């Protein structure tokens, strides 16, 4: 016997106490060591309901990641309200590492193992674990990076596809790499390279998946309709520097129409900018950091998911229009914690 419950979790990690990189520092005094011999066992003849869209584990991970960045990303200036906060702002070492979320005594986590699970509803093949797998807390917009991959098919996740105020998480089958560099002029100009060939192939099989869920209406992609640069652009942090990359070429219907068309294959160069004045995702305000370091600043990452928002209203179509980005940062964790839920033993 057990029941859905919520409780304060602890985290587990392999952070090096000697290292200076900020994730290792936070985890060293905030988490405990991983269990080397972790036991998980199938729950024979059991069917459980999961709901990735209402899962307190997500709120808990968010509170930690917010806590990490506050402790670790010290801006020279922080602007909020009519307050101007000025501290010391030295360059840091920044590379996310896997954190495990674990239950205390009396409780336990349930894991859905259906390869096709979409985040909500019954799950057949279930097991139980002390801790989740290791989740890199990668903060990004539009694209999900360095996450885990959908097991069998590409998987569309939403709390309600018919509700245009609800985020769509596309979970990729296979991953497409993006190669961002700020070469060793303009110290903030950068660019991201993507194998144009593989991305269109994938993106096309995404449109087909969406056609499945939207009754074969024409599926169209468009750039965001507005908002702060943090959402109109693929926004992420690399080596402690804040990148903003124009994804307009990534949502380029020309190559999605399947038309055997020229330069659809071959490398795609997204122009990026490194900014020092950023609008914080955690809390309401602006943060100003010092200019970028020198040398070749290079983060190669895996695209493993896509966040979409669907245009509301009107119809009288014919088609359905999707734009990159959606939701909030909690959605990034949600996309990794989707197969887990905490229950209490009695």
């Amino acid at each position, epitope marked *: 016997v057990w029941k859905d419950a919520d409780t304060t979790l602890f985290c587990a990690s392999d952070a090096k106490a000697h290292e200076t990189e900020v994730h290792n520092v936070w985890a060293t005094h905030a988490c405990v060591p991983t269990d080397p011999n972790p036991q998980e066992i199938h729950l024979e003849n059991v069917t459980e309901n999961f709901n990735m869209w209402k899962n307190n584990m997500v709120e808990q991970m968010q509170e930690d990641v917010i806590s990490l960045w506050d402790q670790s990303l010290q801006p020279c200036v922080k602007l909020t309200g009519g307050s101007v906060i000025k501290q010391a702002c030295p360059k840091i070492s920044f590379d996310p590492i896997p954190i495990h979320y674990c239950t205390p005594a009396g409780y336990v986590i349930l894991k859905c193992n259906d390869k096709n699970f979409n985040g909500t509803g019954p799950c057949k093949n279930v097991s139980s674990v002390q801790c989740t797998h290791g989740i890199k807390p990668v903060v990004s917009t539009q694209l999900l990076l360095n996450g885990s991959l959908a097991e069998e098919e590409i998987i569309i996740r939403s709390e309600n596809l018919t509700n245009n105020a609800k985020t769509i998480i596309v979970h990729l089958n296979k991953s497409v790499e993006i190669n961002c560099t700020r070469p060793s002029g303009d110290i903030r100009k950068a660019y991201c390279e993507i194998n144009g060939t593989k991305w269109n192939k994938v993106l096309k099989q995404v449109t087909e998946k969406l056609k499945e869920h939207f009754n074969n209406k024409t599926i169209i992609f468009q750039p965001p309709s507005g908002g*702060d640069l943090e959402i109109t652009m693929h926004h992420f942090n690399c080596r402690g520097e804040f990148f903003y990359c124009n994804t307009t070429q990534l949502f380029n219907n020309t190559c999605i129409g399947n038309e055997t068309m020229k330069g659809c294959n071959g490398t795609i160069t997204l122009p990026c900018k490194i900014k020092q004045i950023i609008n914080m995702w955690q809390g309401t305000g602006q943060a100003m950091y010092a200019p970028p370091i020198d040398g070749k600043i290079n983060c190669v990452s895996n695209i493993t998911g896509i966040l979409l928002t669907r245009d509301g209203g009107a119809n009288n179509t014919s088609n359905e229009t999707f734009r990159p980005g959606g939701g909030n940062i909690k959605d990034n964790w949600r996309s990794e914690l989707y197969k887990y839920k905490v229950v209490q033993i009695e």
Partner: antibody
Amino acid sequence: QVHLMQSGTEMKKPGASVRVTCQTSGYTFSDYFIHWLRQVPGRGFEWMGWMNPQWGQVNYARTFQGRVTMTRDVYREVAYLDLRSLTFADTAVYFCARRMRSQDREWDFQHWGQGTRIIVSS
Amino acid sequence: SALTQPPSVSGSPGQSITLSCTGASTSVAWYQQYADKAPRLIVFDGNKRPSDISSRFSGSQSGGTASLTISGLQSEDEAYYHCNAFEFFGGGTKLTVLS
């Protein structure tokens, strides 16, 4: 108590643009979307779009796409609606609205501004 | 006119009456609107009533068919009534109360 307080009546000429302001108060502005709708008196509401004040994300009705923008001022706690290329077809009362607390339902509009009359005439 | 509502409906003081809203793709919300005034939410999620709304008002909905029942009608109930499901609204119903 939550209050949505809109700017006054605008009389505009065809081809012009108008901005309507919606001053928020009584709650944490960043925690809720602001929607805009319009209505010809005696008729039904027409939804125009939503705006998420966090990072300013917006979702506009296909009808208004390219003619509308919804912005905000996170500190002063105000949402703006801008509409351009006005026509007599845009004469109406314009409202901002906000959902009920907590619900998770996004479309239950407990809170409305008082409405702003926009009159388009040459 | 995504959702379907009769444009006009009339009732007598003291009796019940049920306004209808058809075509909904989810559970509906209902609003009362006086002329030249702002709407106010009278039921949400098809049949839920906000704590401050009079018990004379009640909602019921099956699939896309939604209904709003007002009992013990009063002249003060004369207004437009609207319903939405997501971003889709009805055309509004003007309720008259024959005074």
